[PDB]
Each structure stands twice: as C-alpha cells, then as structure tokens.
Amino acid sequence: MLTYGAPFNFPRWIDEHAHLLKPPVGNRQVWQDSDFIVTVVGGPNHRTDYHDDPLEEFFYQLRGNAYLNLWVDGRRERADLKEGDIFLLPPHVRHSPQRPEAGSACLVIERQRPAGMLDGFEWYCDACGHLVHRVEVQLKSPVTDLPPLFESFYASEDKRRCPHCGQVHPGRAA
Amino acid sequence: MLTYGAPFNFPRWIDEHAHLLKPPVGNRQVWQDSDFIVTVVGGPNHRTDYHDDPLEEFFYQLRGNAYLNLWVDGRRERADLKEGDIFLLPPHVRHSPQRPEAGSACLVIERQRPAGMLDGFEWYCDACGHLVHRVEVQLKSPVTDLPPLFESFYASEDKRRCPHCGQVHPGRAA
Ligand SMILES: Nc1c(O)cccc1C(=O)O
Ligand SMILES: Nc1c(O)cccc1C(=O)O
Ligand SMILES: [Fe+2]
Ligand SMILES: [Fe+2]
Ligand SMILES: [Fe+2]
Ligand SMILES: [Fe+2]
C-alpha cells in the first residue's frame, strides 16, 4: 500500500500550513510514522540550545533565509541557509538553528533514531565557551518531548550555571 | 568538520549539471560517502525494471513532470510526480520511474543500505503480469553496478522468458 498517501503539491501544502509555520508552533511534520522524518520549519524563531544528532540532517531552505550556529573544530561557526540553499549536516556536529524571518520555510529531513541511539541537547557558556548542561533523550516525539526538556533548563539556575566560570546562562534568550 | 561542505544554491547546481541530467548519464548524486543518498534525476528516460527498495524513498519533482509505475495491492498502478509534487514511497513498494521530459529534475533521497540488506530489481510479463526475473544486489555503487545487471537481463532470452505463459519480455524498451 501507499502508506503515506499519494504525491501532492508542496508549495500549496506550505501555503496551507502558514499558520503553523510561525510562533508558537513553528514547524510541521509532513508524514507520520515514517522512517524519514520530513519537516517544514518556519519562523521567526531563535534558540540557545545546540542539537547533537547521532544521524545526518538534510536542509533545503525553500523560502527566506536562516542560519545554523555551529561548533566546528572546537570553534563557534555559522552556516548560512540562504534562500535556495541545500546542505547536509554530518552526525554529531552541534547545531542551533536561527530563523529570523517570518514567512520563511525550510525543508528538513532526518531519520528516526533506533532504540538506544540517543540525541543530545546542550547549552554553552557565552563567557568562556564551556559546556554548561547536556541532556540525552530517546527522541521519539520531538514536538511534545522537547518543550519540557527545554523548559526544565530555563527553570533551573543550577542547570544554567557554568561549571568553569560560574556565569549563569540566560536560558531561553541569548 | 563539515564533511559534506558548506550550504550551496540548489537551482544553480542543477543548472550547472544540466549536461548530466539527460542521456546517457541521467542522474547525478549530490554528496558522496554520506548516509543520505541525495540524487537529482533528469530526463528523458524510460525503463522496464521495477525497484524493490528495502528502505523508503523521498521524491520532490522540482522541474517538469514524471511518473512512477507501481505495483499496489497486486495491481499495476501509476503515481504522477507533477512539477512541484513531493512523495514518500514506503519500503518494498515495487516502482519503475518514467521521466519523459527533457529538462526535468527530481530530487530523490534514499539512505545507504547496510550490509546484508539487499535491493531487488525485477521485471514483469506484459502479457500475464507474472514476475519474469528478479536479481538481488548489495547496492553500494548503483551508478556503476546497475548497468551490468540490467544489461545481463536484456542479453538473455532465458532471463526474459516468462515462467507462466512463455512470452519473452522485450528487454530494454516496453
Ligand atoms: N533542523 C530542524 C529539525 O530537525 C526539526 C525542526 C526544526 C529544525 C530547524 O532547522 O529549525
Ligand atoms: N528514484 C531514483 C533513484 O533512487 C536514483 C536514480 C533515479 C531515480 C528515479 O526516480 O528515476
Ligand atoms: Fe537537528
Ligand atoms: Fe563559563
Ligand atoms: Fe528506487
Ligand atoms: Fe507471462
């Protein structure tokens, strides 16, 4: 069977889900229960967490512009996703997507992580660059499981306290 | 490291590889040595073989129109990939892509099959619909390993002979 339905027009689908491609929802997964996790991500959205994905992530910035804050070679770096750009992110490269533009739309493709293969979410100290806090999660339902993880970081000065220099991470906003 | 390079503009990449998005090459893989196998497929091309992929395949028909001949519920079916369509194909649905238009371009995303997970390529009898021939292959390098597989089918009346009704499959062209 065509478990995931027939082909359909993607620009019209994006237009039809505009109300979800902005705060507070931000993103919408295209198909459910599939191995390929296919998501369209809108904006605006900024975030301070870095994702440590044990598998690859594919990006195609269909509308508008965004960028990824990265750690590369032990250094803070930025990869621009200009409108029309595609990009393949290797496993475990720490990344923090920033999406300043309303009306933007990025196709993201990931694969389901098998049982035992954990994702990491972590925060870094703006003063000295040391890792402040990391949580590992079996990421089955990100839409609903990530918000409480992030909220528990924002809520705890202990979690936000840099172990190296003592500076308390600002939490939700840079 | 950014093992697969920086982001880059996809429409310009497609324009720059136009000479490969037509016979005899037909398609071009975007990144090498990655888990996500990302390919742009042009045209024109018609084929008689059906692919049995043990994993999912994602399609986004960026330019022009194409279609997939399928077997669904034990019946010959067609899924149109009109310009702008996206589509997620479930594992093992037999499919035979047909790409009649020059200048067409389809983004296809697959994942590397691990050792021991085999692909199938097979042909069906136009007279009675019975399976005529199947080859299983550890698909590490399709660009170079599929042509000899297909050629060995076209070259052998035995391989092309329907076991049910005796009709000899036409081979390369329907
Ligand atoms: N990369 C993302 C993902 O995998 C899910 C939702 C959003 C994003 C993003 O790039 O913002
Ligand atoms: N689906 C395809 C693939 O995986 C590789 C090359 C071509 C195609 C196609 O759809 O024609
Ligand atoms: Fe990610
Ligand atoms: Fe610090
Ligand atoms: Fe295929
Ligand atoms: Fe037959």
PDB file of N, CA, C and O in Angstrom, chain A residues 4 8 10 13-14 17 27-34 36-41 106-109, chain B residues 58 86-88:
ATOM      1  N   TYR A   4       1.833   6.285   2.937  1.00  0.00           N
ATOM      2  CA  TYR A   4       1.986   7.712   3.183  1.00  0.00           C
ATOM      3  C   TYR A   4       1.195   8.555   2.197  1.00  0.00           C
ATOM      4  O   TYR A   4       1.440   9.759   2.084  1.00  0.00           O
ATOM      5  N   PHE A   8       1.689  14.993  -3.701  1.00  0.00           N
ATOM      6  CA  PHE A   8       0.886  16.208  -3.607  1.00  0.00           C
ATOM      7  C   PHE A   8       1.789  17.421  -3.771  1.00  0.00           C
ATOM      8  O   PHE A   8       3.004  17.345  -3.563  1.00  0.00           O
ATOM      9  N   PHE A  10       3.800  20.555  -3.128  1.00  0.00           N
ATOM     10  CA  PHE A  10       4.458  21.011  -1.901  1.00  0.00           C
ATOM     11  C   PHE A  10       4.261  22.505  -1.666  1.00  0.00           C
ATOM     12  O   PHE A  10       3.916  22.888  -0.533  1.00  0.00           O
ATOM     13  N   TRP A  13       0.897  22.952  -0.139  1.00  0.00           N
ATOM     14  CA  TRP A  13       0.911  22.443   1.231  1.00  0.00           C
ATOM     15  C   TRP A  13       1.557  23.444   2.185  1.00  0.00           C
ATOM     16  O   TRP A  13       1.052  23.680   3.292  1.00  0.00           O
ATOM     17  N   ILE A  14       2.672  24.049   1.771  1.00  0.00           N
ATOM     18  CA  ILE A  14       3.334  25.037   2.622  1.00  0.00           C
ATOM     19  C   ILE A  14       2.425  26.248   2.831  1.00  0.00           C
ATOM     20  O   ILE A  14       2.254  26.727   3.963  1.00  0.00           O
ATOM     21  N   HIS A  17      -0.298  25.554   5.341  1.00  0.00           N
ATOM     22  CA  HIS A  17       0.115  25.406   6.729  1.00  0.00           C
ATOM     23  C   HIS A  17       0.843  26.643   7.258  1.00  0.00           C
ATOM     24  O   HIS A  17       1.518  26.561   8.286  1.00  0.00           O
ATOM     25  N   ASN A  27       6.926  24.668  13.335  1.00  0.00           N
ATOM     26  CA  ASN A  27       7.246  23.651  12.341  1.00  0.00           C
ATOM     27  C   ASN A  27       6.128  22.619  12.283  1.00  0.00           C
ATOM     28  O   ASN A  27       5.343  22.465  13.221  1.00  0.00           O
ATOM     29  N   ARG A  28       6.078  21.893  11.167  1.00  0.00           N
ATOM     30  CA  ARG A  28       5.046  20.888  10.935  1.00  0.00           C
ATOM     31  C   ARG A  28       5.668  19.711  10.197  1.00  0.00           C
ATOM     32  O   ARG A  28       6.270  19.898   9.135  1.00  0.00           O
ATOM     33  N   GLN A  29       5.501  18.511  10.753  1.00  0.00           N
ATOM     34  CA  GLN A  29       5.986  17.292  10.110  1.00  0.00           C
ATOM     35  C   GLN A  29       5.021  16.874   9.010  1.00  0.00           C
ATOM     36  O   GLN A  29       3.797  16.949   9.183  1.00  0.00           O
ATOM     37  N   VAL A  30       5.573  16.440   7.870  1.00  0.00           N
ATOM     38  CA  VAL A  30       4.752  16.202   6.684  1.00  0.00           C
ATOM     39  C   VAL A  30       4.041  14.856   6.780  1.00  0.00           C
ATOM     40  O   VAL A  30       2.813  14.782   6.675  1.00  0.00           O
ATOM     41  N   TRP A  31       4.791  13.776   7.009  1.00  0.00           N
ATOM     42  CA  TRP A  31       4.210  12.448   7.141  1.00  0.00           C
ATOM     43  C   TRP A  31       4.458  11.891   8.535  1.00  0.00           C
ATOM     44  O   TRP A  31       5.490  12.159   9.154  1.00  0.00           O
ATOM     45  N   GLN A  32       3.527  11.068   9.004  1.00  0.00           N
ATOM     46  CA  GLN A  32       3.647  10.442  10.310  1.00  0.00           C
ATOM     47  C   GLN A  32       4.083   8.986  10.179  1.00  0.00           C
ATOM     48  O   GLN A  32       3.834   8.330   9.162  1.00  0.00           O
ATOM     49  N   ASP A  33       4.754   8.500  11.224  1.00  0.00           N
ATOM     50  CA  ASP A  33       5.077   7.084  11.401  1.00  0.00           C
ATOM     51  C   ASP A  33       6.046   6.570  10.344  1.00  0.00           C
ATOM     52  O   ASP A  33       6.122   5.362  10.093  1.00  0.00           O
ATOM     53  N   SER A  34       6.794   7.461   9.721  1.00  0.00           N
ATOM     54  CA  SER A  34       7.737   7.075   8.685  1.00  0.00           C
ATOM     55  C   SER A  34       9.141   7.027   9.258  1.00  0.00           C
ATOM     56  O   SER A  34       9.436   7.608  10.310  1.00  0.00           O
ATOM     57  N   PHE A  36      11.777   8.232   7.364  1.00  0.00           N
ATOM     58  CA  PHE A  36      12.242   9.582   7.050  1.00  0.00           C
ATOM     59  C   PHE A  36      11.330  10.581   7.761  1.00  0.00           C
ATOM     60  O   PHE A  36      10.121  10.616   7.504  1.00  0.00           O
ATOM     61  N   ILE A  37      11.903  11.381   8.661  1.00  0.00           N
ATOM     62  CA  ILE A  37      11.170  12.432   9.365  1.00  0.00           C
ATOM     63  C   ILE A  37      11.296  13.703   8.536  1.00  0.00           C
ATOM     64  O   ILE A  37      12.375  14.296   8.462  1.00  0.00           O
ATOM     65  N   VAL A  38      10.204  14.104   7.892  1.00  0.00           N
ATOM     66  CA  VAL A  38      10.193  15.215   6.945  1.00  0.00           C
ATOM     67  C   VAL A  38       9.404  16.361   7.573  1.00  0.00           C
ATOM     68  O   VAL A  38       8.220  16.206   7.892  1.00  0.00           O
ATOM     69  N   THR A  39      10.063  17.506   7.747  1.00  0.00           N
ATOM     70  CA  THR A  39       9.510  18.632   8.500  1.00  0.00           C
ATOM     71  C   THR A  39       9.707  19.905   7.691  1.00  0.00           C
ATOM     72  O   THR A  39      10.738  20.071   7.038  1.00  0.00           O
ATOM     73  N   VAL A  40       8.724  20.796   7.721  1.00  0.00           N
ATOM     74  CA  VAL A  40       8.893  22.160   7.228  1.00  0.00           C
ATOM     75  C   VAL A  40       8.937  23.074   8.443  1.00  0.00           C
ATOM     76  O   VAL A  40       8.096  22.964   9.344  1.00  0.00           O
ATOM     77  N   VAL A  41       9.953  23.929   8.495  1.00  0.00           N
ATOM     78  CA  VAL A  41      10.184  24.812   9.634  1.00  0.00           C
ATOM     79  C   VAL A  41      10.095  26.248   9.153  1.00  0.00           C
ATOM     80  O   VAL A  41      10.809  26.634   8.218  1.00  0.00           O
ATOM     81  N   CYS A 106      11.790  26.038   5.569  1.00  0.00           N
ATOM     82  CA  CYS A 106      12.921  25.151   5.326  1.00  0.00           C
ATOM     83  C   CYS A 106      12.455  23.704   5.365  1.00  0.00           C
ATOM     84  O   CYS A 106      11.831  23.276   6.342  1.00  0.00           O
ATOM     85  N   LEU A 107      12.758  22.961   4.305  1.00  0.00           N
ATOM     86  CA  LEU A 107      12.572  21.519   4.305  1.00  0.00           C
ATOM     87  C   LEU A 107      13.712  20.888   5.088  1.00  0.00           C
ATOM     88  O   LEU A 107      14.888  21.135   4.791  1.00  0.00           O
ATOM     89  N   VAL A 108      13.381  20.088   6.090  1.00  0.00           N
ATOM     90  CA  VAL A 108      14.380  19.359   6.861  1.00  0.00           C
ATOM     91  C   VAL A 108      14.043  17.879   6.792  1.00  0.00           C
ATOM     92  O   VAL A 108      12.879  17.494   6.965  1.00  0.00           O
ATOM     93  N   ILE A 109      15.048  17.051   6.536  1.00  0.00           N
ATOM     94  CA  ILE A 109      14.841  15.612   6.520  1.00  0.00           C
ATOM     95  C   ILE A 109      15.837  14.949   7.466  1.00  0.00           C
ATOM     96  O   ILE A 109      17.049  15.180   7.374  1.00  0.00           O
TER      97      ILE A 109
ATOM     98  N   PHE B  58      12.269   9.230  -0.863  1.00  0.00           N
ATOM     99  CA  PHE B  58      11.622  10.535  -0.911  1.00  0.00           C
ATOM    100  C   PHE B  58      11.832  11.167  -2.280  1.00  0.00           C
ATOM    101  O   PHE B  58      12.942  11.137  -2.820  1.00  0.00           O
ATOM    102  N   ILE B  86       5.678  16.426  -3.963  1.00  0.00           N
ATOM    103  CA  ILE B  86       6.533  15.592  -3.128  1.00  0.00           C
ATOM    104  C   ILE B  86       5.785  14.302  -2.845  1.00  0.00           C
ATOM    105  O   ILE B  86       4.560  14.220  -2.991  1.00  0.00           O
ATOM    106  N   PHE B  87       6.537  13.295  -2.399  1.00  0.00           N
ATOM    107  CA  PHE B  87       6.023  11.934  -2.295  1.00  0.00           C
ATOM    108  C   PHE B  87       6.991  11.116  -1.449  1.00  0.00           C
ATOM    109  O   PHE B  87       8.205  11.248  -1.604  1.00  0.00           O
ATOM    110  N   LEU B  88       6.454  10.290  -0.547  1.00  0.00           N
ATOM    111  CA  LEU B  88       7.264   9.365   0.244  1.00  0.00           C
ATOM    112  C   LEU B  88       6.829   7.944  -0.086  1.00  0.00           C
ATOM    113  O   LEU B  88       5.669   7.578   0.137  1.00  0.00           O
TER     114      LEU B  88
END
